[PDB]
Design a binder for this molecule. Structure first.
Ligand SMILES: CCCCCCCCCCCCCCCCCC(=O)OC[C@H](COP(=O)([O-])OCC(O)COP(=O)([O-])OC[C@@H](COC(=O)CCCCCCCCCCCCCCCCC)OC(=O)CCCCCCCCCCCCCCCCC)OC(=O)CCCCCCCCCCCCCCCCC
Ligand SMILES: CCCCCCCCCCCCCCCCCC(=O)OC[C@H](COP(=O)([O-])OCC(O)COP(=O)([O-])OC[C@@H](COC(=O)CCCCCCCCCCCCCCCCC)OC(=O)CCCCCCCCCCCCCCCCC)OC(=O)CCCCCCCCCCCCCCCCC
Ligand SMILES: CCCCCCCCCCCCCCCCCC(=O)OC[C@H](COP(=O)([O-])OCC(O)COP(=O)([O-])OC[C@@H](COC(=O)CCCCCCCCCCCCCCCCC)OC(=O)CCCCCCCCCCCCCCCCC)OC(=O)CCCCCCCCCCCCCCCCC
Ligand code: HEA
Ligand code: HEA
Ligand SMILES: CCCCCCCC/C=C/CCCCCCCC(=O)OC[C@H](COP(=O)(O)OCCN)OC(=O)CCCCCCC/C=C/CCCCCCCC
Ligand SMILES: CCCCCCCC/C=C\CCCCCCCC(=O)OC[C@H](COP(=O)(O)OCCN)OC(=O)CCCCCCC/C=C\CCCCCCCC
Ligand SMILES: CCCCCCCC/C=C\CCCCCCCC(=O)OC[C@H](COP(=O)(O)OCCN)OC(=O)CCCCCCC/C=C\CCCCCCCC
Ligand SMILES: CCCCCCCC/C=C\CCCCCCCC(=O)OC[C@H](COP(=O)(O)OCCN)OC(=O)CCCCCCC/C=C\CCCCCCCC
Ligand code: CUA
Ligand SMILES: [O-][O-]
Ligand SMILES: [Cu+2]
Ligand SMILES: [K+]
Ligand SMILES: [Mg+2]
Lengths: 459, 100, 186, 131, 47, 90, 65, 62
């Protein structure tokens, strides 16, 4: 059978397969955005169809976060190796594992169908009210997709937590990475569901939470109380992969295993209490701002310890071993790239700097360097390491120095200029802009078309 | 005359002599919504005691404008004229202490 | 860390000790099925996590972060004029909330705000004292600091008396220049 | 009592109490642009303010969350419904400072720019007296 | 005041308020620390 | 122990460190109390820290101040360099 | 059985029918079309053209083409 | 074991091919993005409009 299979390794393959498929839609949307932003004027979207651009950016964000990177790094690699790393025959909950992937596909079909049938409008992937609650039915459909996705995420989290009860070996760092992400999901998702239900109540049940005398800033608190834990639910599995690859390929035992583990635990606790750095410009109280700014800067400490522990893993490794394997290059590239993204995160963490840089393309470049570059490369590196175990073929990736170089160069051509226009300043979530920002926007656009072309050479 | 005369008498006086400065009761927060509602309630209570024509109540309206945007005031001023403004209901017709 | 089960482990008395940890570590464990095996696994975990020097650094960081967190929560509830848990004042119109207005000025003047505001001259080149004077009296009058903020402010001289242009950029000299032109009052 | 409603003595003696003036600022359309206007940033009514003066900006949003951003003045305040956020500023040099809405607000989020022109206090007084 | 073509404007440009100057200098103050953090770490990415 | 390598704590204070579980608990408690105290003893205290006539002037402040005072640099530094806006056009 | 030892044995042993690969690529291609086709449809619905001409929402020179 | 395209590319030295490929991909991207704007001449980029902006900047001391 195909759909009935409960094999945990087969389901892991399904997650990667579906992430690539849905990923095609994600990348296409990204190409639309960059094409439009190539100059000033209308290029591929009419001025009377500006609502489509708002929908393109909204769906891009939602799909890449919840339907591509999360299903790939928390559903794909985890479901394939975690039961093996735990020296257990199979996953604890076989039937739940099957329904989770089916749920993801069904929620994807709902979203894309809503593109085709509903009027196309957008409110960002952060679905801020009151804009989200005064929209058309496409917003209702997107809400159903998120809630359905939430069901799959929570049940998958329950599945991984049960490994503690059955693990027959040692909890390796990677296993710790997934367990903590599962804990972060169990604690953050129920809050998200509540606020999403309130968005529905105002959309569909004549509720009045997001109209005057009701505080719209309330949504942002509950949303981001899940929002930021989400960005670490998306990065922590990547960290777990990086640890395995560096140790295996360099033939070096992980250094400071317990510090790696305790760094992951620390990032989670801290990541659960820093959400309001996304709400700096709303007008929060001075002491609140100072608390959140202080705790946000603390997250660098545990995150920094992991980075340096990775570096010493690559240091001192034997020279005779060939170092041009794509998996090793990607793992090393992750350290180089993640530091850029994190440092810019610390810059935006200072609220006074953030006043200038909120809702600008500097924020875009910041989270792209971590996700669009770092997380993607980590997932690629992990799949590449498991090529023999997974068994896929008909691609030229394993040893392809051209692909790695071209990808690194062109991805930086896209997002490095977006840091510059952040002090120009070019707001986010816009399509038209002043003529004096064309140069940098044009350079980034040339980078986007080039990256897409390099994706064709792998076949 | 006294240097601390503004603080003496009321905390209200401070913004009455300096209309475009922070009110002592709300300077800790950037959000000034509560400040607007207090100022409007004070305009509502002035008219009940002195009438609309009194220069004092006219100035209490200017003070309310200093912190309240026009779109809010126009709406709240219509509710007041009808007799549905909850900040102006006479105290003996309030329901706040009923059924709980 | 002993390597023989015959050699006992020292424990203090209290609610977080080696004995306290042993009693609870294997409560949910299917692997500690007999004394010998249970002790071996217990010492294995203790050796790995509590005899690891770098692990203690994270213990410090969690304590510091949590202590700040608990205190900021408590401070809002106890002192912030805008946080209401009692209802007496919420059953009255805004002009009548005198007990809650009492928190306003004390909360507007925390110690660190008074201590660190004078150091704005380490971030502003022109008129760093533009907002120092205020005739109302809700806050103290501000005097510019005599030294740069300790740390990464190497771009400015360690002490402002060393800087040649500092005095000519003050809001007082700027006011003099513009008042001589009739340009503005401030 | 009358004294529970503090009012300056000048107004009690018959001085005119100040009024307020409201105006709407809209983007200049592409077909209405003039040879020298900056596309995507020009407006039909600018906000004139005096320089070397402390100004309190109270910012709110009527319908959805906008954001009033003027990068040159170091201001980025969210215009959120229900919150009247206070922003204090002190302009030091004359000029025209251009900004854009910084919170996705709907279809035309990219078409509501923020233009503030700072002039000398004597110039501002003359402008305010005429407009 | 207004964006200008092909400008890095690293940390901001053309401040017209004391607060605007503060923002630019806060970024400039931390920028060398960021470079140190990057250079010091990247130099050791090798066998 | 604050900013302390715990390897040193284990070596120089063997009896205080004998129970490593209890030692870990004290580490957490000590730093918890430090964070709590900072908020309510350094930040919260109302109407304090506004004595700007008592700015600390360290020994290095005076070394550099006297050096410039001895020469004319201190007087020259404090002098207002310009107090006019426009130069006179010949 | 030996045939059942490996998951997806036909593919891993390199005997699978190529149609399975074609369907996977087709499915991805259809997913991509969900971003392009509604763009064209929406453009025509609100303008009457499937795609704009660069800078046709702005003033153009007489000889512009 | 590889198709012609990879056999051709993988035969050359990496630092001979890589630099040429990098430039080629970038050039192609620009070409693709220029095909839809051949002959487009917005009025705001003409010399007359360029001068008028300079006048505005002088008046506003931008
Ligand atoms: C008057 C009225 C009164 C009231 C009446 C009320 C009545 C109430 C009724 C209530 C119940 C109704 C529902 C009944 C369900 C019954 C289920 C059941 O028991 O089935 C047993 C039955 C067992 O079958 P069998 O009889 O033993 O024989 C089956 C055959 O031999 C085949 O054997 P097989 O199973 O091995 O083969 C399956 C497999 C065979 O494999 C292949 O075809 C080739 C290999 C894969 C190719 C690559 C595909 C792409 C990669 C996908 C990766 C992720 C996969 C995840 C796992 C699969 C998830 C589907 O292919 C498929 O069939 C599907 C493959 C995956 C398709 C989706 C891939 C993504 C495409 C994205 C495109 C757009 C972008 O299940 C099936 O095999 C079929 C189940 C079909 C369920 C379909 C549900 C679809 C929902 C879609 C969304 C709906 C909303 C929007 C729709 C819009 C439409 C316009
Ligand atoms: C207990 C127990 O018996 O556990 C094993 C027991 C299984 O028995 P077993 O056969 O001995 O297991 C073999 C081992 O797994 C195999 O382990 P092994 O022999 O390889 O290694 C020895 C040791 C290795 O592990 C350890 O020794 C690690 C011990 C430390 C864990 C981290 C603690 C938290 C970080 C420090 C916090 C400090 C706060 C300070 C505050 C100060 C305020 C003044 O084993 C264990 O401890 C295994 C259990 C680990 C449980 C982890 C549960 C989740 C931890 C979440 C951490 C915090 C996340 C925060 C998220 C954000 C929140 C806002 O665990 C269970 O029964 C699992 C139940 C899972 C329920 C999940 C749903 C709960 C609702
Ligand atoms: C991000 C991209 C780039 C990534 C680069 C990096 C990649 C790194 C490597 C990643 C590796 C990941 C792990 C891979 C593990 C692979 C394991 C594996 O192979 O499993 C075996 C698995 C199945 O093999 P098997 O065990 O032999 O299975 C036997 C079957 O179960 C049984 O055989 P059967 O023949 O009996 O099968 C039944 C068959 C029966 O099939 C037939 O009879 C087919 C007949 C021909 C139909 C052909 C299509 C016709 C379309 C017509 C369209 C007309 C349009 C007209 C428009 C007019 C306009 C005016 O199918 C069905 O009945 C159901 C088919 C359902 C699925 C297809 C759905 C298509 C789209 C539908 C859209 C619908 C939209 C509706 C909207 C409605 C709105 C109202 O393999 C596959 O399924 C194929 C996988 C191929 C790729 C593997 C990965 C290779 C490496 C990556 C390459 C790059 C890919 C990039 C993405 C794609 C780009 C486009
Ligand atoms: C996985 C993705 C991911 C990751 C890891 C992070 C990590 C961090 N992010 Fe995040 N962030 C996002 C994804 C991510 N972020 C997204 C998607 C948004 C926008 C959402 C939206 O607004 O719609 C966002 C937005 C965002 C903002 C909002 C800015 C604004 O709205 O204007 C801020 C500011 O506080 C922030 C801060 C941080 C910080 C401080 C970290 C830290 O984790 C970084 C820690 C890492 C380092 C610091 C470098 C490594 C450590 C060292 C080298 C040690 C030495 C360094 C020091 C001592 C400083 N992020
Ligand atoms: C992880 C999520 C993710 C990923 C991969 C990307 C990838 C890209 N994004 Fe991203 N983007 C977001 C998440 C992501 N983005 C979010 C959350 C927003 C904000 C949404 C909002 O504003 O509301 C955003 C916004 C955003 C905008 C802002 C539009 C706007 O609001 O004004 C732009 C264009 O400038 C853009 C461009 C790109 C480009 C050019 C790529 C990439 O194409 C760059 C090239 C890289 C690749 C093509 C490889 C990607 C491959 C995969 C993802 C598949 C991996 C699968 C396996 C390895 C199995 N993105
Ligand atoms: C079981 C027997 C019956 C018990 C019946 C109890 C019934 C009532 C229970 C109500 C909820 C619990 C709190 C009771 C508080 C009683 C005292 C009281 O009124 O407190 C008011 C006071 C502020 O009142 P106002 O004057 O209106 O505001 C002035 C400006 N800020 O509020 C409080 O102190 C109570 C609210 C906070 C409670 C919790 C303590 C605060 C800190 C929480 C920290 C959370 C983080 C984790 C901490 C971990 C442990 C350190
Ligand atoms: C992870 C589980 C623990 C999470 C604890 C988070 C507490 C963070 C403390 C942040 C803080 O100081 O709160 C201020 C901040 C609001 O600040 P202002 O809007 O400026 O209002 C202040 C006066 N009007 O408080 C909140 O938003 C608290 C939100 C509630 C969190 C509840 C978490 C429940 C978890 C179960
Ligand atoms: C060794 C460490 C100590 C070295 C000496 C430090 C010292 O004495 O500093 C004094 C010096 C003041 O000296 P002068 O300005 O010269 O004189 C005062 C004039 N009014 O103090 C400072 O510079 C400030 C020190 C501040 C420490 C702050 C600690 C943390 C406080 C809480 C931060 C925020 C926590 C989270 C939010 C909480 C919200 C309630
Ligand atoms: C031209 C655009 C790119 C087409 C492309 O590469 O499609 C590949 C893809 C998979 O083909 P193979 O990799 O050869 O798999 C069969 C077994 N080896 O081909 C197809 O799906 C053919 C139909 C493509 C239709 C596209 C619309
Ligand atoms: Cu208004 Cu954006
Ligand atoms: O979000 O960081
Ligand atoms: Cu965040
Ligand atoms: K455009
Ligand atoms: Mg915003």
């Amino acid at each position: 059978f195909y759909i009935l299979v409960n094999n945990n390794k087969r389901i892991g393959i399904y997650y990667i397969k579906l992430s690539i498929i849905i990923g095609i839609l994600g990348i296409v949307l990204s190409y639309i955005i960059r094409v439009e932003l190539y100059n000033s004027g209308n290029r591929i979207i009419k001025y009377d169809n500006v609502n489509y651009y708002n929908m393109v950016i909204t769906l891009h964000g939602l799909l890449m976060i919840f339907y591509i990177i999360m299903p790939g790094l928390y559903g794909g690699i985890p479901l394939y190796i975690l039961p093996i790393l735990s020296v257990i025959t199979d996953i604890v909950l076989p039937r739940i594992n099957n329904i989770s992937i089916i749920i993801v596909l069904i929620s994807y079909i709902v979203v894309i169908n809503s593109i085709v049938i509903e009027y196309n409008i957008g409110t960002g992937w952060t679905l801020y009210p009151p804009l989200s609650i005064i929209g058309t039915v496409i917003v209702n459909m997107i809400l159903y997709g998120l809630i359905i996705i939430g069901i799959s995420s929570i049940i998958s989290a329950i599945n991984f937590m049960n490994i503690l009860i059955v693990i027959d070996g040692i909890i390796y760092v990677y296993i710790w990475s997934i367990i903590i992400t599962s804990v972060l999901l169990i604690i953050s998702l129920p809050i998200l569901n509540g606020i999403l239900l309130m968005i529905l109540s105002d959309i569909y049940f004549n509720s009045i939470y997001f109209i005057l005398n009701g505080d719209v800033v309330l949504y942002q608190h509950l949303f981001w109380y899940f929002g930021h834990p989400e960005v670490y639910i998306l990065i922590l599995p990547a960290f777990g992969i990086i640890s395995i690859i560096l140790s295996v390929l360099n033939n070096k035992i992980i250094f400071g295993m317990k510090s790696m583990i305790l760094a992951i635990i620390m990032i989670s606790i801290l990541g659960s209490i820093v959400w309001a750095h996304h709400i700096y410009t709303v007008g929060l109280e001075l002491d609140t701002k100072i608390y959140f700014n202080n705790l946000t800067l603390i997250i660098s400490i545990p995150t920094g310890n992991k980075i340096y522990n990775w570096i010493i893993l690559y240091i001192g490794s034997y020279n005779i071993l060939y170092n041009g394997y794509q998996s090793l290059i990607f793992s090393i590239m992750f350290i180089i790239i993640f530091i850029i993204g994190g440092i810019t995160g610390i810059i935006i963490s200072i609220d006074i700097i953030d006043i200038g840089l909120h809702d600008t393309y500097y924020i875009v470049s910041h989270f792209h360097y971590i996700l669009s570059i770092g997380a993607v490369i980590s997932l690629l590196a992990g799949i590449l390491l498991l090529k023999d175990i997974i068994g896929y073929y008909n691609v030229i990736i394993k040893i392809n120095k051209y692909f790695g170089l071209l990808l690194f160069i062109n991805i930086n051509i896209i997002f490095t200029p977006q840091f510059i226009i952040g002090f120009n300043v070019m707001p986010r979530r816009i399509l038209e802009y002043s003529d004096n920002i064309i140069v940098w926007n044009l350079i980034s656009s040339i980078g986007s078309i080039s990256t897409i072309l390099i994706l064709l050479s792998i076949f | 005359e006294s240097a601390d005369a503004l603080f003496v008498g009321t905390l209200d006086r401070l913004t009455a002599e300096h209309p475009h400065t922070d009110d002592p009761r709300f300077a800790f927060q950037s959000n000034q919504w509560n400040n607007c509602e207090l100022r409007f309630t004070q305009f509502c209570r002035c008219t009940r005691e002195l009438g609309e024509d009194d220069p004092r109540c006219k100035y209490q309206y200017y003070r309310a404008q200093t912190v309240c945007h026009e779109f809010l005031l126009e709406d709240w001023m219509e509710h007041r004229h009808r007799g549905t403004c909850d900040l102006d209901i006479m105290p003996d017709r309030q329901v706040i202490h009923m059924r709980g | 860390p002993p390597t023989r089960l015959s050699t006992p482990l020292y424990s203090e008395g209290g609610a977080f000790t080696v004995n306290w940890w042993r009693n609870r570590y294997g409560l949910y464990s299917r692997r500690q099925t007999d004394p010998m095996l249970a002790e071996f696994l217990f010492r294995q975990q203790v050796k790995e996590w509590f005899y690891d020097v770098p692990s203690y650094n994270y213990a410090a960081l969690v304590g510091l972060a949590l202590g700040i967190l608990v205190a900021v929560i408590w401070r809002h509830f106890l002192f912030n004029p805008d946080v209401y848990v009692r209802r007496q004042e919420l059953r009255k119109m805004w002009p009548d909330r005198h007990r809650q207005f009492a928190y306003a000025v004390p909360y507007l003047n925390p110690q660190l705000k008074n201590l660190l505001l004078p150091y704005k001259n380490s971030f502003i080149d022109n008129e760093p004292d533009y907002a120092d004077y205020n005739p109302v009296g809700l806050r103290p009058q501000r005097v510019m600091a005599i030294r740069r903020i300790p740390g990464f402010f190497w771009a400015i001289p360690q002490y402002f008396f060393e800087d040649p242009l500092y005095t000519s950029c003050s809001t007082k000299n700027m006011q003099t220049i513009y008042k001589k032109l009739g340009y503005s009052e401030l | 009592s009358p004294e529970d409603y503090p009012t300056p003595q000048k107004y009690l003696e018959g001085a005119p109490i100040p009024s307020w003036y409201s105006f709407q600022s809209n983007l200049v359309g592409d077909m209405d642009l003039k040879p020298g206007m900056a596309r995507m940033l020009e407006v039909d009514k600018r906000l004139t303010v005096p320089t070397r003066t402390h100004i309190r900006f109270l910012i709110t949003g009527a319908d959805v969350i906008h954001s009033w951003s003027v990068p040159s003045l170091g201001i980025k305040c969210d215009a959120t419904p229900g919150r009247l956020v206070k922003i204090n500023t002190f302009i030091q040099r004359e000029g025209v400072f251009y900004g854009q809405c910084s919170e996705l607000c709907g279809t035309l989020h990219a078409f509501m720019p923020i233009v503030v022109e700072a002039v000398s206090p004597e110039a501002f007084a003359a402008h305010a007296k005429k407009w | 005041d207004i964006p200008w073509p092909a400008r890095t404007d690293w940390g901001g440009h053309d401040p017209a308020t004391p607060f605007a100057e503060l923002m630019i200098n806060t970024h400039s103050m931390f920028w060398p620390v960021a470079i140190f953090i990057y250079v010091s770490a990247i130099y050791m990415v090798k066998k | 122990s604050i900013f302390t390598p715990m390897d040193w704590m284990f070596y120089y204070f063997p009896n205080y460190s004998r129970d490593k579980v209890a030692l870990m608990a004290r580490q957490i408690k000590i730093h918890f109390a430090i964070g709590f105290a900072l908020v309510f003893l350094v930040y919260h205290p109302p109407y304090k820290g506004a004595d700007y006539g008592n700015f600390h002037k360290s020994p290095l402040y005076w070394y550099k101040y006297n050096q410039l005072e001895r020469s004319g640099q201190l007087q020259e530094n404090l002098r207002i360099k310009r107090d006019w806006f426009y130069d006179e056009d010949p | 059985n030996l045939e059942d030892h490996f998951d997806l044995a036909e593919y891993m042993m390199k005997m699978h029918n190529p149609m399975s690969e074609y369907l996977y690529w087709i499915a991805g291609f259809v997913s991509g079309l969900h971003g392009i086709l509604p763009l064209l449809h929406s453009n025509y619905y609100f303008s009457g053209m499937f795609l704009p001409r660069d800078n046709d929402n702005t003033q153009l020179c007489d000889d512009s083409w | 074991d590889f198709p012609w395209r990879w056999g051709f590319v993988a035969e050359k030295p990496f630092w001979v091919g890589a630099p040429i490929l990098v430039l080629g991909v970038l050039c192609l991207g620009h070409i693709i993005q220029t095909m839809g704007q051949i002959g487009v001449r917005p009025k705001r980029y003409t010399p007359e409009w360029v001068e008028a902006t300079k006048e505005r900047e002088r008046a506003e001391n931008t």
